Symmetry: D2
Subunit: 123 residues, 4 copies
């Protein structure tokens, strides 16, 4: 088995691209995220992401999570998933995400959150 | 106006502290739990995230990741900080708890979802 | 303790009310859903729901699922959960839901689904 | 022109069938799995749902509930029926798997979520 590393350049079937840097010995990493599309009426810009990889038992397919701090809207996405060596020997990030929109009144909180799923593959 | 910095709790009986929020929107914090999805002994785990600063809002959205120290899992949270006129702050979140699975054909059952409100503790 | 039954009239935090009729031998039930808020701009009609309670091992706190076929929107909400006897001995539906919007292009499927959670309590 | 009625599969190897959809949008179908979250023997299971017929879309939304016959669980699916240039149909869906828990204090860990595409069998 290889080790499934988070570090490097990734893409998805939405055509978003994301780059993750070194993971430090606390599991932290930083990177950038450029989306191809958007839920808002706003102009897209690349954005920073920050997260961690779980290092408990030093697993080769670790779980992780990261936050995308969108720099062109009031939104936040969080991703969480696992870095897998797929059947064909490629590393793949299997993720799910929550997209939280900003709402003006707490009475609209019920509808502020979308969910989805994305595979990331090495670009 | 609404700020993430503080000690906070939820109805599961978890306590979370988040420290100061830097110019870039970043913070760190701790998360201690009382109930789990594992048999392993509970340890305090660290957390990192960001609050969105766009248009300098007073009820910002945010996300963070909790890096479990007692299991192989990872939980992410995202929500929005709501404040009233008395300055009562509440964090309305949803979360995803990703378990580790040994084989990729098990990925489908690895993700649990739920919501939690956090109150000032 | 008591059998937690879905049959009856319920309410939530959002001010929605719903009535579930009798549960049949197959665990099927039908009902109506009347909402006090939406994520559209139309006028609220009462909407039909249909679902099932799970009757394996005849649990007193059964899981269930149902579909709300919105009569004033091109959307569908599904709910799934468990009928509990709460701490205070009152019957409660603890549910999670997905709200699926119609999108016009397949490329926009990603953004079509919201998620939340609601307790229902007896009206 | 996108319709639910048919025999379907997904990448987990479950096959579903759905019957005719009546004027009231209702259907019934069956669901057979090859993998489960349970240790019990798989049995085929019934499903019930509706397609949304408002403004009579060629690509309607829908939801259904799978009444598991071999565990105490319920799964609900919701999505949209997409049909392409040549009549190729696909159902884009998302689901919630609700497990049974004994105490209300355990409600929080009871729901998993995922996504699946169904294609014609
Ligand atoms: C493009 N996307 C992507 O590659 N995803 C995996 C999903 C999760 S975040 C969303 C984009 C959000 C921009 C924020 C906003 O519009 O509020 C979508
Ligand atoms: C106590 N909890 C809490 O405050 N939540 C909002 C939910 C989401 S994280 C979960 C605890 C997970 C511990 C790690 C593990 O069990 O592997 C539960
Ligand atoms: C009122 N609601 C309610 O009692 N919920 C638990 C949530 C789940 S469905 C949504 C209402 C949707 C109306 C249909 C539409 O907006 O297209 C919201
Ligand atoms: C095979 N599956 C499938 O085709 N899915 C889309 C997922 C969501 S339901 C689950 C099967 C659950 C069986 C019941 C149980 O384990 O209690 C899995
Ligand atoms: C993703 O990468 C490709 C290849 O580098 C580039 O053509 C494309 O524009 C990138 N996507 C975005 C959204 O910038
Ligand atoms: C949380 O806070 C209260 C008082 O500050 C304390 O009694 C309790 O033990 C703490 N919870 C955990 C899970 O350690
Ligand atoms: C819910 O029922 C209550 C009491 O019967 C009533 O005041 C209210 O109108 C109902 N809600 C809606 C949205 O119809
Ligand atoms: C589903 O359909 C395929 C194609 O007919 C068949 O080989 C397979 O056994 C079926 N799967 C299950 C779980 O019944």
């Amino acid at each position: 088995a290889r080790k499934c590393s988070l570090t490097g350049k990734w893409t998805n079937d939405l055509g978003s691209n994301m780059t993750i840097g070194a993971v430090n010995s606390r599991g932290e990493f930083t990177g950038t995220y450029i989306t191809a599309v958007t839920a808002t009426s706003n102009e897209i810009k690349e954005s920073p992401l920050h997260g961690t990889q779980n290092t408990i038992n030093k697993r080769t397919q670790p779980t992780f999570g990261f936050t995308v701090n969108w720099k062109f809207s009031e939104s936040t996405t969080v991703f969480t998933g696992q870095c897998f060596i797929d059947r064909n020997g490629k590393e793949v990030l299997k993720t799910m995400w929550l997209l939280r929109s900003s709402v003006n009144d707490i009475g609209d909180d019920w509808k502020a959150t979308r969910v989805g799923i994305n595979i990331f593959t090495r670009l």
